[PDB]
Design a protein around this ligand. Structure first.
Ligand SMILES: [Zn+2]
Length: 86
RNA sequence: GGAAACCUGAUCAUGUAGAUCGAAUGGACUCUAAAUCCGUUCAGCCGGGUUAGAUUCCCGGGGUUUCCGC
């Protein structure tokens, strides 16, 4: 499993995973320089580094999650898309 | 010029989903206050190796500190 920058990982899945292991659905994301600006379906906005070595990058290279965000309304199809990356 | 240690909100830790703090935000409560609490969110400086799996081990870059040297 090659270690790519975070924007590649969310570009492939369309999903975000928070520090609590919660999956959110990405509504918008945009890169600027080394930052990513992200807007979830549930309304949360966040600004992170576009690192290939971050904690959330490690989570997105793996296939586990603790819970899905209710307000994001993640479909079983998208969740399954995340679980079967390989 | 050379050696060692460490790494970007803070302190610490770390091969099988790191932690605590702090901050942003929503709510509860409240008197549409303060205080308090709860939910949500925020991480590995960069570029590679190795690995089933790495912020974590190895190499390199950059930076900081300490130490050695014309
Ligand atoms: Zn959400």
């Amino acid at each position: 499993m090659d270690k790519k920058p975070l924007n590649t990982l969310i570009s492939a899945t369309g999903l975000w995973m928070s520090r609590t292991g919660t999956i959110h659905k990405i509504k918008h994301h945009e890169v600027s320089r080394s930052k990513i600006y992200i807007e979830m379906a549930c309304g949360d906005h966040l600004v992170v580094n576009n690192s290939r070595s971050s904690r959330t990058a490690r989570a997105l290279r793996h296939h586990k999650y603790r819970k899905t965000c209710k307000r994001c309304r993640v479909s079983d199809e998208d969740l399954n898309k995340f679980l079967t990356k390989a």
